[PDB]
Amino acid sequence: RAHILSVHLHKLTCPHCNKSFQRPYRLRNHISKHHDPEVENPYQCTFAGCCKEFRIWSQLQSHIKNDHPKLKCPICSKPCVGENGLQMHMIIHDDSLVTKNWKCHICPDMSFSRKHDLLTHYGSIHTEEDIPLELKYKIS
DNA sequence: AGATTGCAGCACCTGAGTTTCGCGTATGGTCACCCACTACACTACTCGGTCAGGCTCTTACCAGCTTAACTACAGTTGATCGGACG
Ligand SMILES: [Zn+2]
Ligand SMILES: [Zn+2]
Ligand SMILES: [Zn+2]
Ligand SMILES: [Zn+2]
Known part of the structure; x- marks a missing residue:
């Protein structure tokens, strides 16, 4: 896998200056500057469903760390x-x-009809230790 | 009534119709071994993002001046807007 990606599929190389970079991320940043189009906002959000674009790489770093x-x-x-x-x-x-x-987290047989009733098994066959968090978490 | 002869009765070797058998030749059946394919859960190396390190480039300067534009003061006229009409 490494041989193919280092001897034949030269994917880490620049399409223009023919330098190369240790990750695809830095190759993307390089293309966005050293071979950039006339576009005002050379950086675009890399994530799922986000459409926003930025002038300086620091603003994109901030946007990823804030909203993603x-x-x-x-x-x-x-x-x-x-x-x-x-x-x-x-x-x-x-x-x-x-x-x-x-x-129950362990006992195969259990079949309760309400949340308060389920706590009887965890309160007797187990105890208040090693009950699952989704049962415990009255967080709202 | 004897010399010549046939009948046919005795016994023992022999022959086939009939049978039981052995094998060939070949066929369905047991069962033992080990192979192929599949697959749930796993092993492990690489790629990839992120971060620091710290070497690196490039800015634009202080007050003044001296080369360059705005950035407020200012006046009659728009046509959305309120709110009530059809
Ligand atoms: Zn390049
Ligand atoms: Zn985004
Ligand atoms: Zn149980
Ligand atoms: Zn969750």
Whole structure:
């Protein structure tokens, strides 16, 4: 895989000056300046569904760090991008919309009908230690 | 009534119709081995983004002046706007 990407598919080289760069990111920045079109805003947001464009690389660095920070779900630690990403993923845990089933983390048999009732099993066969966070998190 | 002779009865070697058999030749059947394909979960090296380090370029200068434009003061006229008409 490395041989193909270093002897035949020269993807890390400039299309114009024939320098090369240690990551595609720096090649992109290089093309955006040293071989740039007459465009006023040489930088464009690299992320999903974002259409914004910028004059100086520092403003793009700021925009990525502000509006596309890479987060982990507070409950399930799965990664997501930006405020919308977190708010979209938080629906999955929501007990008002997602009228989910109720089970033990270990015991195969459980089949509760309400959240308060599920805490009886975790309060007796387990205890207040090693209950799952989605059950515990009365955060709203 | 004897010398010549046939009948036919005895016994033992022999022959086929009939049978049981052995094998060929070949066929369906047991079952043991090991192969091919598939696949859930995994191993591990690379690529990639991000960050620092610190060497690097390039700015534009102080008050004044002296080369260059605006940036406020200013006046009659627009035609959206309110709110009420059709
Ligand atoms: Zn180049
Ligand atoms: Zn963006
Ligand atoms: Zn979550
Ligand atoms: Zn249990």
